[PDB]
From a paper:
We next carried out a local refinement focusing on the upper one-third region of the complex containing a CtpA dimer and the best LbcA density, which obtained an EM map at an average resolution of 3.55 Å. The structure comprises two CtpA monomers, a substrate peptide, and the N-terminal region of LbcA. In the atomic model LbcA approaches the CtpA dimer from the front and is ordered in the N-terminal adaptor domain. Interestingly, only the front CtpA is in an activated configuration while the back CtpA remains inactive. We found that the LbcA N-terminal α-helix 1 (H1) inserts into a space between the two H1 of the CtpA dimer. The space between the two CtpA H1 is widened by 8 Å to accommodate the LbcA H1. The CtpA–LbcA interface is dominated by hydrophobic interactions. However, in the front CtpA, all distances between Ala-302, Lys-327, and Gln-331 are shortened to below 3.3 Å, except for the distance between Ala-302 and Lys-327 that is shortened to only 5.2 Å. In addition, the cap has lowered down by 8 Å to narrow down the substrate pocket to 8.7 Å, perhaps leading to the trapping of an endogenous substrate peptide in the narrowed substrate binding pocket. We tentatively assigned this density as a substrate peptide that co-purified with the protease and have built a seven-alanine atomic model in the linear density.
During bacterial cell growth, hydrolases cleave peptide cross-links between strands of the peptidoglycan sacculus to allow new strand insertion. The Pseudomonas aeruginosa carboxyl-terminal processing protease (CTP) CtpA regulates some of these hydrolases by degrading them. CtpA assembles as an inactive hexamer composed of a trimer-of-dimers, but its lipoprotein binding partner LbcA activates CtpA by an unknown mechanism. LbcA has an N-terminal adaptor domain that binds to CtpA, and a C-terminal superhelical tetratricopeptide repeat domain.
Residue numbers in the entry:
A (entry chain B): 38 to 373, 412 to 436
B (entry chain C): 44 to 183
C (entry chain A): 38 to 374, 416 to 436
D (entry chain E): 193 to 268, 277 to 326, 347 to 436
E (entry chain F): 418 to 436
The structure:
């Protein structure tokens, strides 16, 4: 059929032997091959990693709840540890960290080549510990930012009423049990406006994502027909298809979802499902474009490797990871109630009012 | 266009290369012979046969040469090397068959050394080989 | 009698099999093997790396001054193309294009939409290949300029005269002939003063490094005896020592050497050679502080691997790796109420000349 | 009058700025204290005789002799040189700026004439007393061989810090086994006299250069 | 401002509805 790439294997073996022979430190073959595994996994896909025995044990059970962390969720798509999203209600967000900016060094250690997992692990620490991050803002001059890491506990959902008849549902992060809270907030809001609403500006911006089950629950809340997300990957078990229950606490309210450059996989799932099913109107800026799903594959003996086993897909053929979510209307956030604060929210609320008026009664 | 190593083939070839570089050449030859048997690919047989010839063994060299020649019929050098190695063992009718197969594609041919190697066997085999050579001459 | 790493190779084979049979995008074996080579080269120490075809070619262009180009170095200023410097005495730069020229179009595509690096690559190409570009100056009608790509030698050392009797040599980078260049400069330098130099301020601030031989050559050009630097490594060939020829164009003139925080291995070699030997006054900030002489071993393919063959040691026997040189004066960048550090160096040189009298 | 300091591991700073009967002994006192603070002969002493109105002439002669052991300090009645020099042999860089008048410059004067010290700073203020050579202090005043006008130097803080190889992960260990210094936050615990005053910084830098190239 | 903002709503609203 086809010839084996024996030339490349021979070249690798000879390279290994020459590296062992002509190196400074006495380096044994075991370390060389372990580094080979680590680096092939790293170069193949930045999110993938080789969780060895001790790392596997650490992943099996959480160490402790005392450890806090900056909270920012990062991604190595740019070659450095890029800040995909500073989670709301967190010291990182309160600082000058803005999604899309890089992190060159952490506490004085450059992160030009180190893996994302190592950088994130070094980020987490004891409550109240100071830390200095060197952040390259849109290719500008690097600057140092001092932050105090602490335990992170972000309320999932926040329901306000921008105007009698108009709601506003901010989803900070897709933690567990987000579906229950979202449904309860929708119910209490519906009660607030006498069991009827004219709009609901679901604010999924600067969202670092979360549990896919909770995202599917949220997308179900507003939907009664069609699928939310379906996965694709080479392994047999890669495909996973999700459905929407007919019941809906939304009550057919016209919707406007706001998309900011800090959107993540789960927020992308909800936004893409709502947009593709023609049940919403995306209004913010472009999304981020992260949809890969990583599954830990058990190894031969008390080892494992986290590899990107599949990627998500919105109900249409569009793949969120490849292109992200492209909103129907692109409104750039800027300074001019929550409406009076940001330009995106004011534009969305005005659009909802205009749509309500122009639809007739 | 490039085949893909199976797990066992990859592991065996890696350890064979490591052994060959660490001077444990017997391990390399054995692993390469086994991989030539299983995979049946040209390149593996090529490396196995070159290693076997360098070492100088006869049985492994013959087996690997036959596997290589069958796995790469296009390669005339493979065919003539297999014929030579077989002639080392006292078989020559297959040697002349392989020489004729090479004769289809123009290239360097080995006839005098094989004739010398076949002139020392039993009289019947040499007579049959000479008859076959004369018939081939009538064919050319 | 050392056994092969049988179990470790078993784990490697299993890992490669799973990676190929689980990763979403169909990835062929060759890619994963190349990634593994890159990984086991890069994960040992930061500086060791695996150089592919393009990386090896560009490194070869780096360590040797000559490279294919138009004889002009340019850049982008706030999204606008401006001519930076035409290299003198280069056939490709003989066009003498006006400084600050804004090339509107290169190779049939406007400069807009592509980064300055992409535009430079578009200008760059095989030697002997003519190119045509479109330029508009001061809002005038665009015109076509024809240029001839050629192999241009790039100077690495720049010489100046700051005060009558005092000079200044800046080594932007260490290249194959950099040492020679330095020597040449020194000669012409003394000619500018009719054969008498009262001092000199070598500038090695922000010098990423280069070939070791060039560093040794420049150090010897500034030295007249003793060992300049000696390398140590596990292998036999790495173990090496260098010397200094008695000849010295410097003429034993007072020397002040500047080292910044960006003075990497090769510049650190010259700095340490001139410091551990009482020959020059170091002044500045601590150097980057890396000593590891690497070797570009050529593989069977065009691509090559760069590996940290050995460390280097200064004449005193102290290794500067991971700690860096500590300048004697220890001057930091500041302002006086243009180059404060160089002004301090010149003041120190003049004061030393005066206190030395004749 | 005297006031000592240690600007560097071997670079004392013996301010005087005033001459009196006491200073004749206090100069040697602070010199001994500096010698004990830094063992062995210092690398170089910066005698900041600036803004000094003057004082008792004999005390000035005592200080001069405490710095040099030979020669005639000033002739007009002449002052000789004793064999005892508590200063040992330190490269002395006296400072004169314009307030150096009469007695103060006398201490400078002899030094500048005996080559024992270098007069760094702006020109000095300048019966009659003469320096050891024919040149006087009233005929033309003291002209320092190095003129360093007073100035202020303000270091600029860099937001971005250039990482050293100590920061890089998995860097090779030091060749000699010595400890590797990390690149932590760097700041001045106290504003040193060098960065505050430009003339003093120039004097210290010249002393360091002289010591590194020329012995002592 | 007022006219320009209505202009966005003048057509931005219609495209959201489509036809």
């Amino acid at each position: 059929s086809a010839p084996l790439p024996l030339d490349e294997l021979r070249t690798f073996a000879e390279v290994l032997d020459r590296v062992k022979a002509a190196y400074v430190e006495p380096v044994d073959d075991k370390t060389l091959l372990e580094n080979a595994i680590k680096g092939m996994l790293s170069n193949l896909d930045p999110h993938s990693a080789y969780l060895g025995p001790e790392d596997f044990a650490e992943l099996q059970e959480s160490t402790s709840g005392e450890f806090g962390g900056l909270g920012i969720e990062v991604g190595s798509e740019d070659g450095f540890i890029k800040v995909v999203s500073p989670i709301d209600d967190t010291p990182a967000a309160r600082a000058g960290i803005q999604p899309g900016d890089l992190i060159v060094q952490i506490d004085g250690k450059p992160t030009k080549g180190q893996s994302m997992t190592e950088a994130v692990d070094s980020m987490r620490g004891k409550a109240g510990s100071p830390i200095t991050l060197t952040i390259v803002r849109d290719g500008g001059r690097p600057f140092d930012v001092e932050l105090k890491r602490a335990i992170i506990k972000v309320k999932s959902v926040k329901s306000q009423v921008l105007e009698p008849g108009y709601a506003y549902l901010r989803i900070t992060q897709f933690q567990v049990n987000t579906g229950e809270e979202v449904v309860k907030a929708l119910n209490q809001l519906r009660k607030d406006n006498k069991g009827r609403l004219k709009g609901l500006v679901l604010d999924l911006r600067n969202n670092p994502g979360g549990v896919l089950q909770s995202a599917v629950e949220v997308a179900d809340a507003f939907l009664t027909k069609g699928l939310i997300v379906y996965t694709k990957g080479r392994i047999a078990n890669s495909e996973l298809r999700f459905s929407a229950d007919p019941a809906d606490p939304s009550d057919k309210v016209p919707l406007v979802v706001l998309i900011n450059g800090g959107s993540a996989a789960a927020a992308e799932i909800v936004a893409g499902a709502l947009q593709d099913q023609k049940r919403a109107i995306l209004m913010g800026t472009d999304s981020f474009g992260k949809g890969s799903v990583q599954t830990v594959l058990p190894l031969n003996n008390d080892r494992a490797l986290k590899l990107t086993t599949a990627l998500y897909y919105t109900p249409n053929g569009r793949s969120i990871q490849a292109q992200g979510i492209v909103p129907d209307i692109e409104v750039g956030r800027a300074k001019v109630r929550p409406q009076d604060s940001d330009y995106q929210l004011s534009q969305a609320l005005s659009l909802l009012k205009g749509l309500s008026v122009t639809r007739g009664n | 266009k490039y085949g893909s190593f199976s797990e066992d083939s990859l592991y065996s070839l890696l350890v064979a290369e490591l052994a060959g570089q660490r001077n444990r050449f017997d391990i390399a030859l054995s692993n390469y012979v086994v991989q030539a048997q299983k995979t049946r690919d040209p390149g593996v047989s090529e490396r196995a046969f070159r290693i076997a010839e360098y070492l100088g063994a006869d049985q492994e060299a013959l087996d690997t040469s036959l596997l290589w020649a069958r796995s790469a019929p296009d390669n005339l050098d493979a065919q003539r090397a297999a014929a030579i190695q077989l002639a080392r063992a006292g078989r020559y009718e297959e040697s002349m068959v392989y020489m004729e197969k090479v004769l289809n594609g123009q290239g360097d041919t080995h006839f005098d050394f094989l004739a010398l190697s076949a002139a020392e066997t039993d009289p019947d085999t040499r007579a049959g080989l000479l008859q076959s050579f004369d018939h081939l001459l009538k064919k050319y």
